[PDB]
């Protein structure tokens, strides 16, 4: 409790949605920031946990579902919104 | 993929601490709105968990180590460094 | 297939709400019909099951739980529906 | 329990037939609707289960005993049965 | 916020007027529905008012004037419209 | 008294609500067209006030009390109800 490595500082901004797919329901917040590279930062607020997210995790399918913590369905429902918000 | 409820913005600080406790490191990322007002959010970047948190929080003993998924101490050597933040 | 009973049509009036709970998407659909005594028809649209429902099976618990197939987050939830809406 | 989707109330005729096959009785009700215009459901009364079905959902075997949760010589006369009402 | 009392739906004629007096502009928006079969309601767009207007509350002075708060010279000017629109 | 600007008519779908809360009766009626900037025409069928409701009129706190003419008691049931009666564009 006695050694520190970093504390910075960034005022970037933070989405928050609330869209709804077919069967689910999705409550998502999205943060983007330039201290990574591109891929913005995702909690499903739904299930307490989050992923670091660019195209080429989008690309890779068993991931969405695996970081958010959701069953393969809603994966690509949360997959195609991102495939739009993701640059 | 049909309906949106709701779709607000608010622009915001955010903190990146990284420290080393007694018995491991520590890499988090804290982020504070107003949407929870006097409860800001925390974000545990080797575990993906996170939780949003306020004073109440921390006065319950299981709760944060639980919140993010980790051992006791880093509970408290956690609950130690949230202290004095909020 | 070697002896038809009855094929009566009455008419009767249906309802498609949908909506969104807490955590959970609900979609229902609701008959009320002539041929049932005052009580009303739910189909769960997406688990497959349904109910003729009285105020009497709303008051004993678990029950909308149990008979749409619903756990008793969501069944309470969609019992805290059905009390709004009786007319 | 708030944010509702869709609420659209429509009054429609909802015939129920019941008929018997080679070992047991059947009681049904088909509710028809412009909604899913292509397709029309049946309420097993029996089973308190029922599907929304439609000639593509008759070409697909252990699909009614399925969804009806009835014995596979059951779904097929059921099947046999609608054939002459949709179709 | 339990037990609704009616939860109605009426496909409706609305149209939307607007007329210049000698000092004042309106923006009136009738809505003729069944529920009210005698009576076509008139909002002023302009005053966050209404009221329900029947062929004999034209016949009463200053009470147009009253339902939508406006002074008798634009009570005037409407009761002038409407009294072509009612009979 | 003399001039007109526009006359139009159109097809619209009116609600008529009412419902009990924990304090009074509310007797709504709600009018969408596709004429105001995709919100909806909520009348207080009780006290003839009336508003152009969105998302956002809502969460611009004592709103819907002020504008229908409800002491905010009344207000937030009614918001409330609103709430899950509303979209967005």
């Known amino acids: 409790i006695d050694m520190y490595l970093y504390?910075?500082?960034?005022?970037?901004?933070?989405?928050?949605?609330?869209?709804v797919g077919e069967h689910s329901r999705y409550d998502?917040?999205?943060?983007?920031?330039?201290r990574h590279y591109?891929?913005?930062?995702?909690?499903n607020m739904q299930t307490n946990k989050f992923g670091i997210i660019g195209t080429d995790d989008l690309?890779?399918?068993?991931y969405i579902a695996?970081?958010?913590g959701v069953n393969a369905e809603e994966?690509?429902?949360?997959?195609?919104?991102?495939?739009?918000?993701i640059h």
């Open 7 to 19: 504390d910075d500082n960034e005022e970037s901004q933070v989405q928050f949605v609330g869209f």
């Open 28 to 34: 998502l917040m999205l943060v983007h920031t330039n």
């Open 66 to 68: 695996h970081i958010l």
């Open 59 to 62: 690309k890779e399918e068993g």
């Open 38 to 43: 591109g891929k913005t930062l995702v909690l």
């Open 75 to 85: 994966g690509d429902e949360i997959t195609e919104y991102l495939n739009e918000v």
